[PDB]
């Protein structure tokens, strides 16, 4: 119930949630651990973590390169779970969501993957390539191990989808602001969905895709969303400062402080 607690807390502060994304192991394990602590220290309310996958078909160049850089460092899925445990042993309340692709969770049993998530302290799991029509086994397994199954609500969702998403999801509802793939390279009116989701008692919505500026997060909150997720804008700072780790952390701090301030 990490998400439930955070949201009730943020509401009591009339505040929105700022959730940054990074790929576990980019540019290296040790440096990644360092980036994550900097993220939290600067104000992150929750975390969205992607484990390195060979074929990320829902990601743009920025995030595609994050996976490649991680692969270059030799980060394996088993090494990822080791990283996750340390992050929780350090930060007990922060919600942690995993960005996954289907094969990595089905690979050696759907059940066993979610069991491992529980054992590590993971809070939610979004499988980018599993639509509602195919979620049954992932939904069931997640619920059985106290992991929240994240469902995606596209900007063109009809009543039938909205009702389904509201009913099956938990933790947070991923409100897709745009069509296409991840990328702050190009920007992205969700008032209607936001109201209908609230009507069907869906989990609080977090707006994701294209969010790269302070004004963008304030707008999400004003629309009625409980917060916003930002990945490319974050990963871009890592890409920029690969030769100067210290520079990375410093610039990483300034960006998330600015973004957090915008949710007040």
């Amino acid at each position: 119930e990490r998400y439930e607690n955070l949201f009730a807390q943020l509401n009591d502060r009339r505040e929105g949630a700022f959730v940054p994304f990074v790929t576990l192991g980019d540019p290296g394990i040790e440096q990644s651990l360092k980036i994550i602590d900097t993220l939290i220290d600067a104000g992150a309310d929750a975390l969205e973590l992607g484990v390195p996958f060979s074929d990320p078909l829902a990601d743009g160049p920025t995030i595609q390169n994050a996976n490649l850089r991680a692969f270059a460092a030799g980060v394996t899925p088993a090494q990822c779970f080791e990283m996750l445990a340390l992050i929780r042993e350090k930060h007990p309340t922060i919600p942690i969501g995993l960005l996954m692709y289907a094969n990595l969770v089905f690979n050696n049993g759907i059940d066993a993957f979610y069991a491992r998530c529980e054992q590590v302290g993971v809070d939610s799991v979004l499988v980018a390539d599993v639509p509602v029509e195919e979620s049954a086994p992932f939904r069931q397994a997640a619920l059985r191990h106290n992991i929240a199954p994240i469902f995606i609500c596209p900007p063109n969702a009809d009543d039938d989808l909205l009702r389904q998403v509201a009913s099956y999801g938990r933790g947070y509802t991923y409100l897709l602001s745009r069509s296409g793939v991840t990328g702050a390279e190009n920007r992205g009116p969700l008032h209607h969905l936001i109201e209908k989701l609230k009507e069907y008692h869906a989990a609080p919505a977090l707006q994701g895709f294209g969010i790269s500026s302070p004004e963008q997060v304030s707008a999400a909150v004003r629309a009625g969303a409980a917060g916003a997720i930002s990945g490319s804008a974050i990963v871009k700072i890592i890409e920029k400062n690969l030769a100067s780790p210290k520079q990375m952390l410093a610039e990483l701090r300034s960006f998330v402080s600015a973004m957090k301030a915008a949710s007040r």
Binding site: F53, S54, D55, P56, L57, A58, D59, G60, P61, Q64, L68, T76, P77, A78, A102, N103, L104, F106, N107, N108, A128, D129, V130, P131, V132, E133, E134, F151, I152, C153, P154, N156, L161, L176, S179, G180, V181
Partner: protein
């Protein structure tokens, strides 16, 4: 959905939520098309007067001399474009048109699907976009020039391993943002439903023609029909009409590369592991950690690291049998057909021929009526087989 997305445990619709309405749209347009005598008459005319349908069924007398085997070959190598791939893309193009679409997105490895998508679009007046891994682009200059000469836009993908896999990725990425104006022309009988069903149906002519043809020439159905399996389109097209004829054996051949035991092959259905990828649940070339891997073969066209769901299913219930053939084995069959029949077969099809040749050679006194699907022309492979 209007039709079943699964063939037993295999198949499905594993794509991001954003692409689901695109798939339901396509399915519904297909169910309608299939009922429309006007669509049917148009598709038929294009196959006959433009593609060269029906293709011949050639008896190979020289090759089977001294044995009790009677071998015939389905002349798909005589189709406009040099491969079976042409039947399919025409139908899919007519579907895109039916849907009000004016743009085509394509995936290609060796180049064949690229050339076929490019020609269908030129004929039917559609704007074609084609994704090709930078490695394959460099490796396949002739097909790339052919594509461009036919008005198609070729786009090199440098991500991942820069090959078919990554081309498949960039295409879906593109499609997730353009599905409203563009139609994705998938190149094989795999991927998310309704592609496996649509590709089969638009490749059915093959076995349908083969039946009547063999019935006329021999007054009997064959003992077995053989076909190579890269992704599964030519194989299923041959198979389909004979599925309800229990006495006819259906044999699929997968590339063995340097040998199964070396791990340097492209036989996932038989030597891979079931996974979820490319909007599908099916056997796959995978690392122990679930990272998608590459398929290897002397023939570039048998590179697809997975396989069609209907094949995985026909295998599980025992309706069809699957085997493999190594590089050296496919080369021998290539050489043999050139020399004894004067036909230059694609190295792809050569895998199918090689198995039919083994069937004969291993048991020369066995009475057998065989049909191999010669899915393509081998002019393409002259230099490769030469070096």
């Amino acid at each position: 959905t209007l039709l079943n997305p699964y063939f037993g445990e295999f198949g499905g619709m594993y794509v991001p939520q954003i692409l689901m309405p695109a798939l339901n749209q396509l399915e519904e347009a297909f169910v309608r098309a299939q009922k429309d005598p006007e669509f049917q008459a148009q598709f038929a005319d294009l196959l006959k007067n433009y593609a060269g349908r029906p293709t011949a069924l050639t008896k190979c007398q020289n090759i089977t001399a001294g044995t009790r085997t009677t071998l015939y070959l389905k002349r798909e190598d005589l189709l406009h474009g040099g491969a079976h791939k042409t039947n399919q893309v025409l139908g899919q193009a007519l579907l895109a048109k039916r849907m009000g679409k004016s743009e085509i997105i394509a995936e290609t490895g060796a180049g064949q699907h690229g050339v076929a998508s490019a020609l269908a679009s030129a004929l039917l007046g559609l704007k074609c976009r084609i994704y090709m891994g930078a490695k394959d682009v460099e490796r396949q200059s002739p097909n790339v020039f052919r594509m461009r000469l036919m008005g198609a836009e070729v786009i090199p993908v440098h991500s991942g391993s820069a090959t078919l896999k990554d081309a498949c990725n960039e295409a879906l990425r593109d499609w997730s943002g353009s599905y409203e104006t563009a139609h994705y022309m998938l190149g094989t009988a795999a991927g998310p439903h309704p592609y496996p069903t649509i590709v089969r149906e638009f490749q059915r002519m093959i076995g349908e023609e083969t039946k009547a043809q063999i019935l006329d020439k021999e007054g009997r159905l064959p003992d077995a029909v053989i076909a190579c399996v890269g992704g599964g389109s030519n194989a299923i097209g041959m198979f389909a009409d004979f599925i309800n004829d229990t006495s006819v054996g259906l044999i699929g051949v997968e590339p063995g590369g340097h040998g199964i035991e070396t791990g340097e092959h492209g036989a996932p259905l038989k030597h891979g592991r079931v996974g979820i990828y490319f909007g599908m649940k099916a056997p796959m070339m995978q690392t122990a950690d679930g990272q998608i891997e590459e398929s290897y073969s002397i023939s570039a066209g048998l590179d697809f690291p997975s396989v069609g769901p209907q094949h995985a299913y026909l295998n599980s219930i025992g309706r069809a049998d699957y085997v493999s053939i190594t590089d050296d084995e496919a080369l021998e069959a290539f050489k043999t057909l050139c020399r004894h029949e004067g036909i230059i077969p694609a190295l792809e099809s050569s895998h199918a021929l090689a198995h039919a040749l083994k069937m004969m050679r291993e048991q020369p006194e066995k009475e057998q009526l065989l049909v191999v699907n010669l899915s393509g022309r081998g002019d393409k492979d002259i230099f490769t087989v030469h070096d």
